[PDB]
Amino acid sequence: EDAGLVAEAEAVAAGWMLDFLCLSLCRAFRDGRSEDFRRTRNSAEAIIHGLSSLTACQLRTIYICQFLTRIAAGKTLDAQFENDERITPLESALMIWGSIEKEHDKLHEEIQNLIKIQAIAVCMENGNFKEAEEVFERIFGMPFKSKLLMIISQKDTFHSFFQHFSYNHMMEKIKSYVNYVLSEKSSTFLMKAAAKVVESKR
Amino acid sequence: EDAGLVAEAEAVAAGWMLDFLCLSLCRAFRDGRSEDFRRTRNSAEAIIHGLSSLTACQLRTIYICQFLTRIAAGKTLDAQFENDERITPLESALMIWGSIEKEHDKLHEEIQNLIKIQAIAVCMENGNFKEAEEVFERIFGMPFKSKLLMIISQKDTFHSFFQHFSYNHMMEKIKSYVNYVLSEKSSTFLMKAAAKVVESKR
Numbered sequence: 001e002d003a004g005l006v007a008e009a010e011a012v013a014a015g016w017m018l019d020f021l022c023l024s025l026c027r028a029f030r031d032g033r034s035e036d037f038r039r040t041r042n043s044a045e046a047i048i049h050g051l052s053s054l055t056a057c058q059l060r061t062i063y064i065c066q067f068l069t070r071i072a073a074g075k076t077l078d079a080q081f082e083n084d085e086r087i088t089p090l091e092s093a094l095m096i097w098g099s100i101e102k103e104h105d106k107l108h109e110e111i112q113n114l115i116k117i118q119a120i121a122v123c124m125e126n127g128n129f130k131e132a133e134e135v136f137e138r139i140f141g142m143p144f145k146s147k148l149l150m151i152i153s154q155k156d157t158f159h160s161f162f163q164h165f166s167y168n169h170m171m172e173k174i175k176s177y178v179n180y181v182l183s184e185k186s187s188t189f190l191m192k193a194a195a196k197v198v199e200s201k202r
Numbered sequence: 203e204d205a206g207l208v209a210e211a212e213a214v215a216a217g218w219m220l221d222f223l224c225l226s227l228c229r230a231f232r233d234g235r236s237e238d239f240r241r242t243r244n245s246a247e248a249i250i251h252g253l254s255s256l257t258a259c260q261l262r263t264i265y266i267c268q269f270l271t272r273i274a275a276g277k278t279l280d281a282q283f284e285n286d287e288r289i290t291p292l293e294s295a296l297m298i299w300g301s302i303e304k305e306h307d308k309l310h311e312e313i314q315n316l317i318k319i320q321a322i323a324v325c326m327e328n329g330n331f332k333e334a335e336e337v338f339e340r341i342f343g344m345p346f347k348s349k350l351l352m353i354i355s356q357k358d359t360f361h362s363f364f365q366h367f368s369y370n371h372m373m374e375k376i377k378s379y380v381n382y383v384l385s386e387k388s389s390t391f392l393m394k395a396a397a398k399v400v401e402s403k404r
């Protein structure tokens with residue numbers, strides 16, 4: 001029994017499971033299925049934990065999943081995450097977004113700006129305006145910097161600016177980017193083989 | 203986009219991942235690769251969490267993985283497990299062993315008896331003789347019952363009885379049972395496809 005050939009087979013299958021789970025995470029994010037997103041992310045996170053070396057293509061996959069994970073927790077009051085990260089989930093997503101090997105196209109910029117604004121807005125929505133300032137000072141260390149600080153200082157959560165740079169607009173733009181990832185990975189081994197089984201059944 | 207066909211495909215692929223991960227768990231258990239066993243069990247446990255309905259064949263797979271999991275933690279001093287279970291890991295394994303849909307062949311009996319004896323022995327080995335009695339009273343509520351209670355009372359950890367019903371003998375018997383499971387699942391979709399990729403490479 002060649003343990004090296006078996007270990008190699010287990011790594012091939014791990015790469016197959018990673019792509020399958022990224023597709024599933026993207027679809028659950030797109031469809032708004034929170035519990036399926038949560039359970040799929042737990043599966044992907046455990047599979048990724050098994051992998052010790054990743055290719056350029058696999059690193060992109062895990063960072064997209066990390067990005068979608070933080071975005072989903074944008075309005076959540078996570079303490080431990082902030083205990084270690086010390087930053088808001090959206091701020092973390094911004095870091096990943098600006099670190100992924102992706103074309104900095106117009107959508108990239110649009111998504112980036114939305115996340116930035118929403119990082120502050122979400123805090124205002126939950127009533128933590130001090131954090132909103134802390135998030136503002138961390139992101140914006142541009143004649144809109146004095147407007148944004150004025151909005152935060154006046155607890156103007158429903159300013160027209162926040163209606164143009166809204167949570168729904170952030171989500172729609174991220175969801176359209178997800179659709180390109182979904183179209184790219186739709187043809188991966190595990191999902192392609194699985195759909196052929198269901199198509200051959202009925 | 204038929205969400206029902208996609209959900210069905212995701213369940214087919216989940217069943218494929220479950221069998222693949224059971225094979226990997228069995229091989230890591232057989233080879234004595236603790237960290238790979240730990241990481242594979244975390245992967246299988248997350249995949250299983252995603253599944254809400256299991257077939258007779260899938261229930262057998264998850265119970266075999268549960269069995270191997272408790273056995274691996276036989277000598278571990280788990281508190282929370284005992285906090286909820288209130289029993290030793292080996293005792294838990296015994297329950298699963300006697301509940302799995304499997305032929306009660308000679309090996310079954312041999313494995314069962316070994317686990318029983320070792321459940322007490324492991325406690326004696328760690329110095330908890332009170333628990334050994336608690337484990338003894340829980341399992342044995344047979345002229346060897348007065349011998350076993352005498353062995354525990356006298357802290358006779360190295361009695362000839364424990365050398366016939368030893369940890370290594372329990373492991374060897376469980377490992378030979380694992381080899382039948384391994385031979386049965388060796389032909390599952392994910393592993394069979396993965397090995398064909400590595401064979402076609404070199």
Ligand SMILES: NS(=O)(=O)c1ccccc1OC(F)F
Nearest residue numbers: 041044045048062065066069
């Ligand atoms: N970091 S990772 O690649 O294990 C991963 C993958 C999918 C979802 C979450 C996630 O990490 C988690 F911390 F966000």
Ligand SMILES: NS(=O)(=O)c1ccccc1OC(F)F
Nearest residue numbers: 243246247250264267268271
């Ligand atoms: N119960 S389960 O089917 O999710 C499972 C599968 C493999 C290993 C452990 C495990 O449970 C764990 F509690 F032991």
